[PDB]
């Protein structure tokens, strides 16, 4: 799923097969560097792609004046009464109209959907 980088030329490690032991290697094509993989996976296509948006939203948005605040949704982490809700607005999950909250107390920035 990720990119492995060589350790000599720092180019990208492409997967190849180890016949004599039949084990998946990652080998660089500018060196003879090889690395016995730990994944045994080469490529993953997520078509439905259930995504967490609680991970894209950065807590800095609690500094937005144009964002609606709330009181009847206290942060579970710190118990701060206020929050700052908004929607996804992302071409993938733009279909639903789910609200995410970002605790507005400084130093907390705890995101949560309900």
């Amino acid at each position: 799923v990720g990119i492995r980088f060589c350790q000599e030329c720092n180019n990208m490690l492409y997967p190849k097969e180890d016949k004599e032991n039949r084990i998946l290697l990652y080998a660089c094509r500018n060196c003879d560097y090889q690395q016995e993989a730990d994944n045994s996976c080469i490529y993953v296509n997520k078509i439905t792609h259930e995504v967490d948006e609680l991970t894209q939203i950065i807590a800095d948005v609690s500094q937005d004046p144009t964002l609606p605040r709330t009181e009847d949704h206290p942060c579970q982490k710190c118990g701060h009464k206020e929050a700052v809700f908004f929607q996804s607005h992302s071409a993938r999950a733009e279909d639903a109209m789910r609200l995410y909250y970002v605790c507005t107390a400084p130093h907390c920035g705890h995101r949560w959907t309900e």
Binding site: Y14, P15, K16, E17, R22, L24, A37, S40, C41, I42, Y43, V44, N45, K46, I47, T48
Partner: protein, 255 residues
């Protein structure tokens, strides 16, 4: 809805939840822990490629289209044969998947310059196959009909107007489909599609399927619809004359 799913194009990409090209050399080992059991069901007694394209298909999307993986394997070896093995579980088990492996080229076809032509590695090859066979297997449908809307009509122009044995007109309400994309000749030749109705709003397709008089009548119907949409009224004389000028030469004449 059964005829609906028989008409609408269902490729493999619309069914797939996710894919994954594992490296799995000995299927009895089965790097994927979940498959391991039913895989030996095919390996109790049946070479193979180590690269394994594992497709997890969505379940609700195959309940809808009334698709079973049996038919997906059939579609696949219909295009590739047993050049490309497919394995599948039994459907009463959860998260039905499909394990595909490019079988091999058995012992012949020697002496060629394969390493010379810088052949793609087997993983890249299986991925190109996964795009070649994901874009379209066309498990169902007419490959020109993108979307299909089933619904009950309310305007009497699309209701089955019969004459009761009493002698009076009665409007029977019943389901009609509205596709998107025309394959008239293929559509109206299948079971439980009314061939004596089932028009189209494409007069070139009507001209090629049903002829010049049918395109005259349908062209008049479409003009009448476009014009009578906003409650307007044009006499039939004028529509008839326009549609007689447009089609009196044997073919469709734009003006």
């Amino acid at each position: 809805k059964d005829i609906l799913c028989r008409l609408e194009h269902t490729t493999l990409r619309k069914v797939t939840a996710n894919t994954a090209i594992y490296y799995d050399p000995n299927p009895q080992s089965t790097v994927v822990a979940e498959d391991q059991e039913w895989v030996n069901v095919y390996y109790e007694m049946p070479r193979i490629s180590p690269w394994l394209l594992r497709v997890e298909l969505d379940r609700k999307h195959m309940t809808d289209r009334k698709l079973t993986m049996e038919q997906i394997a059939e579609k696949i070896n219909a295009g590739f044969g047993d050049d490309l093995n497919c394995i599948f579980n039994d459907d009463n088990a959860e998260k039905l998947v499909l394990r595909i492996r490019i079988m091999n080229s058995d012992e012949n076809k020697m002496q060629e310059e394969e390493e010379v032509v810088d052949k793609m590695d087997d993983d890249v090859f299986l991925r190109c196959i996964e795009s070649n066979m994901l874009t379209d297997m066309t498990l169902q449908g007419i490959e020109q009909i993108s979307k299909v809307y089933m619904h009950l009509p309310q305007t009497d122009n699309k209701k089955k107007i019969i004459i009761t044995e009493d002698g009076e007109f009665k409007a029977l309400q019943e389901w009609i489909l509205e596709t998107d994309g025309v394959s008239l000749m293929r559509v109206l030749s299948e079971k439980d599609v009314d061939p004596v109705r089932t028009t189209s709003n494409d007069i070139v397709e009507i001209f090629t399927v049903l002829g010049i008089e049918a395109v005259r009548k349908a062209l008049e119907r479409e003009l009448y619809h476009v014009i009578s949409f906003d409650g307007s009224y044009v006499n039939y004389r004028h529509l008839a004359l326009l549609c007689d000028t447009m089609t009196c030469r044997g073919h469709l004449m734009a003006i």
